[PDB]
Write a structure and sequence with these properties.
Its main location: cytoplasm. The chain contains eight helices and five strands; from the N terminus they run E-H-E-H-H-H-E-H-E-H-H-E-H. By secondary structure, the chain is α/β, with parallel strands linked by helices. The protein has one domain: P-loop containing nucleotide triphosphate hydrolases (Rossmann fold, 3-Layer(aba) Sandwich), CATH 3.40.50. The structure holds adenosine-5'-diphosphate, (3R,4S,5R)-3,4,5-trihydroxycyclohex-1-ENE-1-carboxylic acid (SKM) and chloride ion.
Length: 165
């Protein structure tokens, strides 16, 4: 089982806090987004564009289930993995760290638009707040630890988690 599974909105720090937390624990980071682009050989954008979200979500879920069983390090989920109920089910019993971020900050953290199909285009503030409205209940539902990352720097978020594992 992972030492911890990080979830939260795009730009909440999953990948960054993931890396740093893995380094601190001396374990591997598995980043499901990364695991998908390797498993498929495609970008996340290319999948969303050629295959659609439903098809991404299915590939994501399979990867997520395997990671949850096979990885003993830090597992960072794609930002919308929690929208799959099979994902949410496979999370039950795990150490799930919900990185919380305000919309204004999240908007700004994602502002060099990392790809992110679902944040792409203009009206990014609006889209980000709508992602938050829909997913926040889902993150809270799967979370065993909620960490506010709003005015905490990545090292402090890492320490807050480490101290609570
Ligand atoms: N606690 C934090 N404080 C400041 N910037 C952060 C923090 N967490 C992440 N970031 C920055 O925000 C950007 C998005 O982080 P990332 O780890 O890619 O988020 P996610 O994996 O959740 O999309 C990165 O440049 C990272 O450097
Ligand atoms: O639905 C989402 O919020 C996301 C999906 C993909 O772009 C990536 O899996 C990412 O981490 C965000
Ligand atoms: Cl994300």
């Amino acid at each position: 089982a992972p030492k911890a599974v990080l979830v939260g909105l795009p730009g909440s720090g999953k990948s960054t806090i993931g890396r740093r937390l893995a380094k601190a624990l001396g374990v591997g980071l598995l980043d499901t987004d990364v695991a998908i682009e390797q498993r498929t050989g495609r970008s996340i954008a290319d999948i969303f564009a050629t295959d659609g979200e439903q098809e991404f979500r299915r590939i994501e879920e399979d990867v997520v289930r395997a990671a949850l069983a096979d990885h003993d390090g830090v597992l960072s989920l794609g930002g919308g993995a929690v929208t799959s109920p099979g994902v949410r089910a496979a999370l039950a019993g795990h150490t799930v760290v919900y990185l919380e971020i305000s919309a204004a900050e999240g908007v700004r953290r994602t502002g060099g638009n990392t790809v992110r199909p679902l944040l792409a285009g203009p009206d990014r503030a609006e889209k980000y707040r709508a992602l938050m409205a829909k997913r926040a209940p889902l993150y809270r539902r799967v979370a065993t630890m909620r960490v506010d990352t709003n005015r905490r720097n990545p090292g402090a978020v890492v320490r807050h988690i480490l101290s609570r594992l």
